[PDB]
Design an enzyme around this catalytic site. Structure first.
Site: not given
Length: 173
Positions: A11, A20
């Site tokens: 991440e 994202d």
């Protein structure tokens, strides 16, 4: 290597609003802010997920749509997100038993997936799941690789799969 280090790898750690792999506004270690294609809403959500934690009990803290975050702050959200994903697993009829049978390393591969696509999202992996349960590493790897998850986020899925297949941290080494 550990689940926290794994998710930090996968991440990253961004202290400023970012998007994202689906284009959605996110912050910290992969904490979704909003699906609105609006930076304004993001801030709004951010300034709500940030002051919310130590909000009312005492004096103020800021109250201003900056869009930046404190490492510690990112940490907090990160700790909630992971806790959430873990509890989603335990609470899920389909994920629970698979999880229960897994070893510590494969367990974080499961958390990792839950953390990325949600409880229901992972539970829909009928085959892979049953194979993981049966300890059919190779077979589960192959199935997962044929999914749309892998298709959209290959780099990450491969790492995750390698983790399911081997039961080692090789892919994060």
């Amino acid at each position: 290597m550990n689940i926290f280090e794994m998710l930090r790898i996968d991440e990253g750690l961004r202290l400023k609003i970012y998007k994202d792999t689906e284009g959605y506004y996110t912050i910290g270690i992969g904490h979704l802010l909003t699906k609105s294609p609006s930076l304004n809403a993001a801030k709004s959500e951010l300034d709500k997920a940030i002051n919310a934690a130590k909000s009312e009990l005492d004096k103020a803290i800021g109250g201003g749509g900056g869009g930046v975050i404190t490492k510690d702050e990112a940490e907090k959200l990160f700790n909630q997100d992971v806790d959430a994903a873990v509890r989603g697993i335990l609470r899920n009829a389909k994920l629970k038993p698979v999880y229960d049978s897994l070893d510590a390393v494969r367990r974080a591969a499961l958390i990792n997936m839950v953390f990325q696509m949600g409880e229901t999202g992972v539970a829909g992996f009928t085959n892979s799941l049953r194979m993981l349960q049966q300890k059919r590493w190779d077979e589960a790897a192959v199935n997962l690789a044929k999914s749309r998850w892998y298709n959209q986020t290959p780099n990450r899925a491969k790492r995750v799969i390698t983790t399911f297949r081997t039961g080692t941290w090789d892919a994060y080494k």
